[PDB]
């Protein structure tokens, strides 16, 4: 019902129809009628709800045939379909569009829907498929008692007995999820499935979810945690993929907590997607995004300033041209009754970079990991709600221990560097 649509011709002023094995175009289009209702399916086949059959011709013997029929041509490219109909039917501006909205017929293609459990290793729903000589164009609950929506991963479940569960967008977390009662976070460890990162990213999105994000040390300890006793290597949605940026979370979460393996990450150019390993007791490694590994999903239900200080929104900001270590830079802020600058918004980053930093190369900012290594916090106890690393940053967490963060160049993105280094700094108080 969501991605089912009606084909329409302006040149012929009528929608496509199917009757038995013959195709007619009728000017009076009613969405109520299923014989006029179509949807895209696998193998570039076009599926009809009313007839529960596919459109095809012969290698101009056009009509409607069973999808299983291999000897005919049942394949259609949406981008040419409009042009083809005009040829085989004569719709002699004269273009073919979706009935409701003037959208191309490629507006709602068939998305591979990835399974979750079952003897099928996450393999996508084969649509259509045949159980007990009945054609299905989606997931059905018939053949179960628990009522859970399931589908097959082959042309014939009677012959192959290959099945899987269906993804369900929801705001509860039951049967398919474990729940952390401290944070209302629901996690899903798909040990058996084997999908790419891009494929896995999809399978999570399909469930009103996304790939894992470990934003706090508590999350890692909890997960460490649920992995206990098991053997696997799982995708986590830690990517290097933003060409113009460093590491980030697939859910645009702030990268404040790290748990890389000792000699990791190596090959940040070829291996752009991160994984969690049980063997390292929760440690992170980066691998090739093309490889097929299990994955983990995560979802959550439901001013007048001082004289030398320029203002932005709630707070006042000032530049210290004097060069110092990170720590001695923070002290000079205290002497001013403020702390090292803290950034919580992109707007705040632009101002600080455009108005305050100006044409100075590098600057210390409030971010560090001195309290606990690998866990970054702002100096003024502010929440880390924003992360804007430069490409392949951060990288100095295992080499320096006392790892501190700087703004670098015009763009305003960040490098991490030992607090050894002497640079200018920016202060912020209200």
Author numbering: 40 to 98, 105 to 137, 155 to 364, 380 to 507
Reproduce the article's own wording on this structure.
The C-type mannose receptor and its homolog Endo180 (or uPARAP, for urokinase plasminogen activator receptor-associated protein) mediate the endocytic uptake of collagen by macrophages and fibroblasts. The large extracellular region of each of these receptors consists of an N-terminal ricin B-like domain, followed by a fibronectin type II (FN2) domain and eight (MR, Endo180, PLA2R) or ten (DEC-205) C-type lectin (CTL) domains. Here, we present the crystal and solution structures of domains 1–4 (D1-4) of Endo180 and a mutational analysis of collagen binding. The Endo180 D1-4 region adopts an L-shaped structure with a short arm (∼60 Å length) consisting of the ricin-like and FN2 domains, and a longer arm (∼80 Å length) consisting of the two CTL domains.
